[PDB]
Amino acid sequence: NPEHYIKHPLQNRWALWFFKNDKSKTWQANLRLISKFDTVEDFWALYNHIQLSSNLMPGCDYSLFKDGIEPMWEDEKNKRGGRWLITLNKQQRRSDLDRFWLETLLCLIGESFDDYSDDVCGAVVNVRAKGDKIAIWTTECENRDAVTHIGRVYKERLGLPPKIVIGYQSHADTATKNRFVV
């Protein structure tokens, strides 16, 4: 009976990345792959082993991306895409950052956006003194139906009230403005 001894396979294999700001190095050189996993059990072994986002020094990031997509604008699956951005104030590092980030991780590995989960590339949390950010990256900023559906589902899974609006920005606009709001 496989149920008693097999790990539970995820729909995708995922890679977690870490960024630490070091002014001696280029941005790309500061980005490092931490490890990959493709089962529920290996996801939790990795999550339980690493620091909470709220405990990282300012200027660090985590990124979780599908295996084979690097967490940068230049990747073939990100260059035409964008991100749903959650901006946190300084008080929300205490209240919401870690629970929003873990909910974001679970939206990814559990493929929570129905048919549009294939548009998801990954997610990024930026820990910064000025205010942290969490974002889900999708692969095509022109797919209105995929993008808007991901944003609506994500907003409800974060539990954000209708008093809050979140915006979607294309990486091309960042690399050089919300395309969509929910």
Curated annotation (Swiss-Prot):
Gene Ontology CC annotations of this record: chromatoid body; cytoplasm; cytoplasmic stress granule; cytosol; eukaryotic translation initiation factor 4F complex; glutamatergic synapse; nuclear body; nuclear speck
InterPro entries recorded: TIF_eIF4e-like, TIF_eIF_4E, TIF_eIF_4E_CS
Keyword Acetylation included in the entry's annotation: yes
* Localization per Swiss-Prot or TrEMBL: Cytoplasm, P-body; Cytoplasm; Cytoplasm, Stress granule; Nucleus
Note one Pfam family from the annotation: IF4E
Q: GO annotations under biological process?
A: behavioral fear response; cellular response to dexamethasone stimulus; G1/S transition of mitotic cell cycle; mRNA export from nucleus; negative regulation of neuron differentiation; negative regulation of translation; neuron differentiation; nuclear export
Q: What kind of modification does the protein receive after translation? A: Phosphorylation increases the ability of the protein to bind to mRNA caps and to form the eIF4F complex. Phosphorylation also enhances its mRNA transport function.
Its quaternary organisation is: eIF4F is a multi-subunit complex, the composition of which varies with external and internal environmental conditions. It is composed of at least EIF4A, EIF4E and EIF4G1/EIF4G3. EIF4E is also known to interact with other partners. Interacts with EIF4ENIF1/4E-T; promotes recruitment to P-bodies and import into the nucleus. (Microbial infection) Interacts with murine norovirus viral genome-linked protein; this interaction plays a role in translation of viral proteins.
What protein family is recorded?
A: Belongs to the eukaryotic initiation factor 4E family.
What does the UniProt record say this protein does?
Acts in the cytoplasm to initiate and regulate protein synthesis and is required in the nucleus for export of a subset of mRNAs from the nucleus to the cytoplasm which promotes processes such as RNA capping, processing and splicing. Component of the protein complex eIF4F, which is involved in the recognition of the mRNA cap, ATP-dependent unwinding of 5'-terminal secondary structure and recruitment of mRNA to the ribosome.
The record, for PANTHER family, names: EUKARYOTIC TRANSLATION INITIATION FACTOR 4E, EUKARYOTIC TRANSLATION INITIATION FACTOR 4E RELATED
The protein, known as? Eukaryotic translation initiation factor 4E
**Which source organism?**
Mus musculus (Mouse)
